[PDB]
Design an enzyme around this catalytic site. Sequence first.
Site, mmCIF file in Angstrom:
data_model
loop_
_atom_site.group_PDB
_atom_site.id
_atom_site.type_symbol
_atom_site.label_atom_id
_atom_site.label_comp_id
_atom_site.label_asym_id
_atom_site.label_seq_id
_atom_site.Cartn_x
_atom_site.Cartn_y
_atom_site.Cartn_z
ATOM 1 N N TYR A 70 -4.396 3.605 6.574
ATOM 2 C CA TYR A 70 -4.781 3.365 7.529
ATOM 3 C C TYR A 70 -6.797 3.785 8.045
ATOM 4 C CZ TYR A 70 -0.615 0.542 6.927
ATOM 5 O OH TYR A 70 0.451 -0.180 6.618
ATOM 6 N N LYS A 122 1.045 -0.978 0.172
ATOM 7 C CA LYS A 122 -0.744 -0.169 -0.186
ATOM 8 C C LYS A 122 0.926 1.191 0.466
ATOM 9 C CE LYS A 122 0.367 1.940 3.202
ATOM 10 N NZ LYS A 122 2.022 2.418 3.726
#
Lengths: 335, 335
Positions: A185, A100
């Site tokens: 996140y 990510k």
Amino acid sequence: RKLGYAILGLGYYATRIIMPRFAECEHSRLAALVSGTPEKLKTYGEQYGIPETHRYSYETFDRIIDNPDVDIVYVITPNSLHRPFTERAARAGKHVMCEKPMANTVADCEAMIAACKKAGRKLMIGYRSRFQAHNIEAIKLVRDGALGPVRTVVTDHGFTIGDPKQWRLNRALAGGGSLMDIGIYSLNAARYLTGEEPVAVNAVESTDRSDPRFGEVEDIINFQLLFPSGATANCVSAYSVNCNRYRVSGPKGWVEIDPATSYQGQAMRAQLGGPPAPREPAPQPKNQFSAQLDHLSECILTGREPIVGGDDGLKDLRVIEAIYRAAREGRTVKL
Amino acid sequence: RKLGYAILGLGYYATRIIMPRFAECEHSRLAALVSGTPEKLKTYGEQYGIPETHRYSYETFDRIIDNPDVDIVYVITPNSLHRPFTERAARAGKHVMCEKPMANTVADCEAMIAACKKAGRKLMIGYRSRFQAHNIEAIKLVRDGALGPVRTVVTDHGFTIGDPKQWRLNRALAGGGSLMDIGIYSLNAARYLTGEEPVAVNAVESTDRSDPRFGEVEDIINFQLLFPSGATANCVSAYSVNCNRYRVSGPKGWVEIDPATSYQGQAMRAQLGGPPAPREPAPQPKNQFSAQLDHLSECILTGREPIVGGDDGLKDLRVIEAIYRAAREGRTVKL
Ligand SMILES: NC(=O)C1=CN([C@@H]2O[C@H](COP(=O)(O)OP(=O)(O)OC[C@H]3O[C@@H](n4cnc5c(N)ncnc54)[C@H](OP(=O)(O)O)[C@@H]3O)[C@@H](O)[C@H]2O)C=CC1
Ligand SMILES: NC(=O)C1=CN([C@@H]2O[C@H](COP(=O)(O)OP(=O)(O)OC[C@H]3O[C@@H](n4cnc5c(N)ncnc54)[C@H](OP(=O)(O)O)[C@@H]3O)[C@@H](O)[C@H]2O)C=CC1
Ligand SMILES: OC[C@H]1O[C@H](O[C@H]2[C@H](O)[C@@H](O)[C@@H](O[C@H]3[C@H](O)[C@@H](O)[C@H](O)O[C@@H]3CO)O[C@@H]2CO)[C@H](O)[C@@H](O)[C@@H]1O
Ligand SMILES: OC[C@H]1O[C@H](O[C@H]2[C@H](O)[C@@H](O)[C@@H](O[C@H]3[C@H](O)[C@@H](O)[C@H](O)O[C@@H]3CO)O[C@@H]2CO)[C@H](O)[C@@H](O)[C@@H]1O
């Protein structure tokens, strides 16, 4: 049966976190190394018993197509390099694990998805938290109805970033600031805790441009999400404070984790029926890193879809684009 | 010496929370009762030894002007009645303690302020948290520079409200929903922890209008604040979840309280250069309620201005108006 991983980009996350965790994998093994630093190929090649035939530079990487010991390429480079290495891996006939954030833009994610689809290979994004015991416990509590309908998610992720010269503070390599790196996140948790995709986005950006760290990318960008069920999220993303947590709440109670998405050290507290109290989650057989690695291997072996596929990374980038737009235009952006 | 309070509106907060706390006051005493319920005047008059000559109805309240035992009227009614009772108290020559939220609108607050100024009498709003030990400790850490400059405040206030027939769920008497009653603590905390006033506001409102509770006023309205220094706040206001907390963070660390603004049971945790750990605040001479009561009495005796005067209540209502507008118009509202 173990599938072979090639690890590409031998930086901090690859060498200090991921590569050691092949130890607890049951369906994955370290098969090859890909690096732009010849010394690293030698150092880690010797450490992990990887023969020179299985060590590649970024210039020789495409030859990996002829290496049958490699089933998966794990791309662990700066964000802007995720797309081209993922496409090259796919053309080399390899499945791909990509760190990510997936890429800089929605269009880049779409290109990566199309390349793997064209190759007939699987694509998974490294959202390790979906394999982490406390996170799974919070998701299951929500899904089991322990909270009632989700009403709010409050989640903060940030760290006090240091060296101004690192790639995370360089727009060409990072694609953006705190939101691309750590704020994602908060966003990802909002999505997996509600089980929904947002339909409206607000954001506030705050960055001291006189700080030598923040000439190119943002420090703070906090955002709000509205979901179709009526659930809401308040999210912090920051490069100038330390936080790592979330609380999801409904009419019947709430559950929080702090730290939530750290490499280790998770602690969970819940208010269900009575006063808030610590809760121990069901332990997982493997740590979140080995579990992540094995998940892709197991999907390939049994022909199942990864729970965090390219589409998940793309859904995050769609909201990230809207978050940046909302802050720029000072309006609620609709999705 | 002690100044005499008249308590007006003998409801839950007046009778269960405030009136017992005169016991620990050093400059305040219960002197009169004002009520729309004859039975309550008898009950509490007898219980507290308040003579029938010091008991008023809302019809006879203006006669309190002739009662020299009364220095201060403490207005503890539904929100829409704060302004008229405050104005009558000021015209009766009394100083005024008015409960939060100050009034329904900015204009109503301005009117109450002008009434007290015209009467030459002081006006204070019941923001008891400013006298609560943990809250004082958090403000102190900020002002002493323990955290570095404030970067984020993340604060959630809400409770699962019950009976749909109560005045809080009636727009005519409450003036608004969760934001008026409980979300105002998030706002007020953002302001006293930063020590600033916001210059920009985002908000998201989410209310299930098929819920019997929410025909008239809002359930959830979450908001973002930007301050001149660059500090940010993410705030929750809710009538369908339970939360009561805040964390303020800067680059050197953070401090949080949870529950933050409850009547009792506050707990504080701080992260200051080491891992998060419990922290005990410096102790206060007396509880937040008695401290609040004595603060106004002491201000009158020494001529000082209350730390939470009418202008504090007004500043909150100014931002509250902008929060509702930001939600309604789906844009960042500037202040
Ligand atoms: N899921 C998680 O918990 C984490 C995810 N990440 C993700 O992992 C990726 C890498 O992060 P991290 O490992 O922390 O970063 P590092 O800088 O520590 O490692 C980056 C590596 O990528 C390679 N690379 C290739 N081209 C470049 C370039 N132009 N500039 C710099 N490095 C280059 C280098 O390896 P070589 O010398 O072999 O070419 C470098 O060491 C990012 O996408 C990040 O978001 C990071 C940390 C944790
Ligand atoms: N600072 C804090 O921590 C708290 C602040 N508050 C504030 O105090 C005020 C009252 O809250 P609470 O005491 O909980 O509410 P209650 O309903 O328990 O008490 C309200 C009282 O106001 C009087 N009243 C006058 N006109 C009306 C009317 N038209 N309808 C209903 N009651 C009326 C009545 O007293 P009588 O019968 O004597 O006329 C009634 O009992 C509100 O402004 C609230 O925001 C509330 C709780 C805690
Ligand atoms: O309380 C949680 C942890 O806080 C601290 O971890 C920091 C790291 O020091 C920092 O490098 C950064 O790591 C993240 C990384 O930048 C990002 O690319 C990746 O996807 O997530 C990493 C981990 O979150 O941010 C974290 C903040 O969580 C602290 O060092 C650690 O001991 C704590 O457990
Ligand atoms: O964890 C904090 C407390 O949570 C619960 O308290 C609730 C009350 O039950 C509820 O009446 C409400 O009280 C607030 C009131 O509505 C408002 O007018 C006033 O200004 O503030 C009051 C106190 O906050 O909301 C609180 C939530 O804070 C719970 O009952 C209690 O045990 C907890 O201590």
